[PDB]
Amino acid sequence: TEIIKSFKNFILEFRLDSQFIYRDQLRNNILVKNYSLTVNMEHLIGYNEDIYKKLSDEPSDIIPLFETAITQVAKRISILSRAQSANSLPTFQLILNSNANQIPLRDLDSEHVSKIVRLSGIIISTSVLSSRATYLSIMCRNCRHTTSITINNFNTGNTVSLPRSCNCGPDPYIIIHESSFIDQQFLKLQEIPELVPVGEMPRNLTMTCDRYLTNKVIPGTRVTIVGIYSIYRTPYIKILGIQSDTEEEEEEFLQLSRNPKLYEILTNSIAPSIFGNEDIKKAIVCLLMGGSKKILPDGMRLRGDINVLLLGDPGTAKSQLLKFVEKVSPIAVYTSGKGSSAAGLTASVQRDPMTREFYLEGGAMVLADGGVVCIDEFDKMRDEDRVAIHEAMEQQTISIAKAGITTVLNSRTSVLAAANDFQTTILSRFDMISIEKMKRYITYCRLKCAPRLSPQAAEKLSSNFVTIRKQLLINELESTERPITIRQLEAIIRITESLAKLELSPIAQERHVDEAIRLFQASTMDAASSLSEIRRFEQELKRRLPIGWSTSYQTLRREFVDTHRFSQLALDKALYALEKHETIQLRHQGQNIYRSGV
Amino acid sequence: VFGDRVRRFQEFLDTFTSYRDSVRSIQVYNSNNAANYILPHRIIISLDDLREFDRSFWSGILVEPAYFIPPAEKALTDLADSMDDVPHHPWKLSFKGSFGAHALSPRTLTAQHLNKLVSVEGIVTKTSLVRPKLIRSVHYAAKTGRFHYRDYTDATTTLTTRIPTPAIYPTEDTEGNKLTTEYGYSTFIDHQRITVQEMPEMAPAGQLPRSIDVILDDDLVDKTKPGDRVNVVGVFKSLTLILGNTVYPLRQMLTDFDIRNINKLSKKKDIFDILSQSLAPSIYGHDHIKKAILLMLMGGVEKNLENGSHLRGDINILMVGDPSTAKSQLLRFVLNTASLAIATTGRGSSGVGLTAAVTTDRETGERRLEAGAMVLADRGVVCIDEFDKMTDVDRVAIHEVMEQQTVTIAKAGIHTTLNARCSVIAAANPVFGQYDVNRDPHQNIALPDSLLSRFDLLFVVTDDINEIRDRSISEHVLRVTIPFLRKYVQYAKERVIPQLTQEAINVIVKNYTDLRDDNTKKSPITARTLETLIRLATAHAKVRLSKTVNKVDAKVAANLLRFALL
Amino acid sequence: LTRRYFLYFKPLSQNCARRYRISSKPLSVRQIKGDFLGQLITVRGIITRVSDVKPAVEVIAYTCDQCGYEVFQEVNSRTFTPLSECTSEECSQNQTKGQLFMSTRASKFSAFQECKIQELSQQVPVGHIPRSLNIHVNGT
Which segments of the protein form a coiled coil according to its record (chain C)? Predict the structure, then answer.
């Protein structure tokens, strides 16, 4: 009762910036009927030492007393507000967030059980919005007697149980359902996979979510959860609050930033045993941040991140440099093509072991919000994940169309893939074909600066574009059919922004563009190494076999074989062009003669 | 506690005779139809007369309808018996009007205010099969020729939960004799189970929609169909669903300072070019294409003819060319700057397309539906990129919904049609990968001629390497507003409707007869194009928000035609 | 069981309805309203789907060699279960509960046939499609 008056004095007497922060928030939440309020732990430890230590030691018996004091002052607020202009009040659930401590998942021990606990992680699953009760009328089936039972904060050997007796014998009770129910959720949380030991997979934890914070957390983000570490032996978390996203280190980083051969030693440091490939190493180290993110006032902003692709024979650190980019970078998780062993890159959905709940198993494409993604074995991709990565590599947004939830999400991912209709997605969607102090400088540069470009260094880019368009047109009008776009020019601009951003400068000069054109020329050298085809195909169909029968893959194989122009890729290319130009005769022949064969 | 509420509702009905003469009209209409040989016995109650008459009764209806709705319907049945004096069924109620904080979005609908009645608007996704249920079953004993009857109750016939009586169907008599099922004297009441989620314009688009289930009685089973905006009024019972009793089938705020700015910008003859140039500054060039995109997102007129079919007001645009430019970057701008827009990839739809998805169920009623993408947006715009990868099923679907704006689905249980008055923005790529002027302009599209006739404006974007024009793209991308044009477009869409004049009929007649030249030189001209040649004019005339069209609107439509055709 | 005939009905026409001054109106399948389940209705329409004539049983006859009293059970649904247990008047007062057999000759059958009636073309509303309905016929 004294704690009731203390919490009421804390609500109606706390001042910050010459104003109350809980009274107006309670009035605004009562006026929209939200039945919740945001309290901070720092304000109550600055107000009273008789509250926080008892809340940290015994939260389960002091928290509903605070809750009933909140409803007691809320009833007065409601009756004085309803009488001004234009009964039954539920128990107001409180949410409470703080940032005083962030303990890891490996520091959880046998001590401080059922206390307050605050930690970060990645939500993997929100499975079923299930139902419980909060007030229920119960009746008997034998002596016609009824009553009711109420619960407020206790939502397997616990608080709620039906009475065995009111003779009526054991269990004569019937729940009067329509004169009585709340929502609750079962969630799963795992630790950050960028900092998890290599010998074992990351562990997880189960948590119970109640009424006011339901459907607020999308699974796959950096979520900081504060609650009660309770035991059901097995541990579980009762959520009571939710939120989400050394000077010598900066001194040595500023001393290392003043070195003029810094780029060069960085490259002499990312390759300890890799012989050669300086242009691959500079493109790998320049594809972390991306480019200049600019928020234009018209709303049509530009993308800053880029794409890099590794290709070659097995070996030469195609999967060893990826471990260094998994451990160096701020937010990155190692995965592979078509998922992996009991984990997936894209949205993997599985079945629940209990009650047969359809829920998503996991995904690393949601967990990389604001960083890069890194995969191996690009040739082994499923068709249900290729469309998702096809849209996310150029628009950075993942759209889900399930019947339960239809969420689109900002992926904000760059890709660093390795490999060994695929031709257009390789050649068009890809632009290129201490350690703690370095990571700290990378995070400070990604959050602090927003560079730009000078026209003095942009005229060299314009002259380079004019010369490459005037020089590769000789190879392109000569029917080589391989390209040159403005997207590659925008990628060149993003590469220059990343190279000028690494020295922590908002301006760009010719010093970065002379390395950028040298970085781009290796990608163009790797990329470099209709009237006739349609005259062939069309004249063939038209003037040769209108039924097409007898004229299929054999007969073209003969003609083109005997005309020495056939390449299977070229054959199926002209053909796919014909079905695709909707020669609906070519549609028809495909339907028949193709696997009719000749 | 029942007698005081029934006398208070009797005093309210004696004070307001608007429901008494209405139920007398219901009874005299039923008597006239019986004399010739029906209405579903419900009276809508205006809630505005209930607040000033009784505050406690109003508060009791708003917080406890399980204890306030059955004495009011008991008073209504007693008034129906007292108002009628001829010889010889229940009566229900309905509400309307403002609710205050009880009127809310279904995504904000949570575990609070369970027993209280909820008014919730949105869009329906599924409408189940109509299913009859037994509430009373009769039987006959042929050993003596008698008749027996039994009644059935559940948790959906009353607002309060009754004691559960699991009445076993009589397969035997109490004496033990044989019996039969007298099919016909036993009444049947049909029920429906529909699903409704939030509207895409009021919801914070980017999130997931939350849907709820409505259990429907006999009376209102013929007024629900998918694809329409609806507002349901029911009770949030949790045995979680709503017992829908009232269904009504049926966005930036405007100040007085913004209307002065759009009235100031209404008479200058330089407005159109700077408004077309101000939509996307990250894309160099293509002024006439975004001029048509501006005329496209503002709309048409949607003329409905008297005693005939409606006329198409929507415009459709197809854009082709080399894949080097910003065709995939323009869809994000038109998705983020329109009133409401739905974008799809054109390949990857789980159903049969973007309309009429998969139908299956696992619950009590073994039938369920699903809503697509085009049935959600009814007045906005939809964007389909990679048009050549889209299969023939969706092509047959857009052949049918292009100039008719209606979609018909002949299923095993569903045989209805629905409105699809939307505008399509298609973006395609050639099958050869690249295209130049010397190649023929018909086989490079690799689409049928009927789809060329369906789409109104076909925009070809060339990208041959030229050293003169390509010098400033790098400095332009290396270097009026967003909340103003939205208010401009919606005020033009809501207030001003343009009409034709004689000054703009003759020049468009001259242009159509002069092109019907292109048939011998480069492109076929159809009759549908006549309609699209004035739609755009009207567009320009409503861009300037004039009450009627002008000759310059037909001139700028002919200029857009010369750029998109030649 | 001893029904030699088959009973059927027919309604009155409109000429006998105007005389002496309804029960037989031409009804659509969109004009069913749900609540007409149990009224005699006269539906007008085209017939697209018909089935073959098949014998559906009405009563199952079981014979015994131990007692001789042949029993008859009545089915009403689409399916049924075989009554292997004897429910005669002689096996109730007995320890023995001997096997029963079925008779396909003494059992009464009926020429059952299902049909799908469709909605008329000019009677359907604007935009709607002509939905179907099922008719189960028996006998002659």
Answer: none
Cβ contact A498:A443 at 8 Å: no
Q: Are A33 and B477 inside 8 Å of each other by CB?
A: no
Length of chain A: 598
**Look-up of token digits 């004294």:** A2
Q: Is A319 exposed, middle or buried (0-12, 13-18, 19+ CB in 10 A)?
A: middle
Mutate to test the interface with C, among B415, B417, B419, B421 (most CBs of C within 10 A): B415
Contact C34 B410 (CB under 8 A): no
Token pair recorded at residue A222: 């950096």
Please name the chains neighbouring B, where neighbouring means 3+ C-beta pairs under 8 angstroms. A, C
Phi-psi region of B169 (alpha: psi -120 to 50; beta: other; left: phi over 0): beta
> What tokens does B473 get?
């793209």
Q: Which stretches does DSSP call E strand in B327-472?
A: 341-344, 381-385, 406-408, 417-419, 423-427, 457-461
* CB < 8 Å from B in window 30-59 of A: 31-33, 35
Q: B interface mutation test: which of A211, A581, A586, A587 has the most B CBs within 10 A?
A: A581
- Rounded to 10 degrees, the C-alpha dihedral A314/A316/A320/A321 comes to -130
The resolution in angstroms reads 7.7
- The pair phi, psi for residue B190, each rounded to 5°, is -90, 150
How far from each other are the two terminal CA atoms of chain C, in whole angstroms?
18
Q: Which two tokens stand for residue B160?
A: 């309060």
Options 3.40.50.300, 3.40.1350.10, 3.40.1160.10, 3.90.226.10; CATH for A247-528 is 3.40.50.300
CA-based R_g, chain B, Å: 30
Paired with B383 in beta bridges are B343, B425
Give, to the nearest 10 degrees, the angle between helix A23-30 and helix A2-13. Answer: 90
A519 closest CA partner among A494, A492, A490? A492
Strand partners of residue A539: none
| Interface contact flag, A177 B155, Cβ < 8 Å | yes
Rounded-to-10 torsion of CA A340, A346, A347, A351: -10
Lookup: tokens for B27: 């009874």
Q: Which residue has the tokens 């309020």?
A: A37
Of B161, B336, B432, the CB nearest to A179: B161
Q: 3-state class of A49 per DSSP?
A: helix
Residue in C38, C128, C129 closest to B183 by CB: C38
Judge whether A304 is annotated as a binding position. no
Distance CA B293, CA B426 (A): 12
Pick the CATH number of B1-102 from 3.40.50.970, 3.40.50.1580, 3.40.50.300, 3.30.1640.10: 3.30.1640.10
A195: region left, alpha or beta (phi > 0 left; psi from -120 to 50 alpha): beta
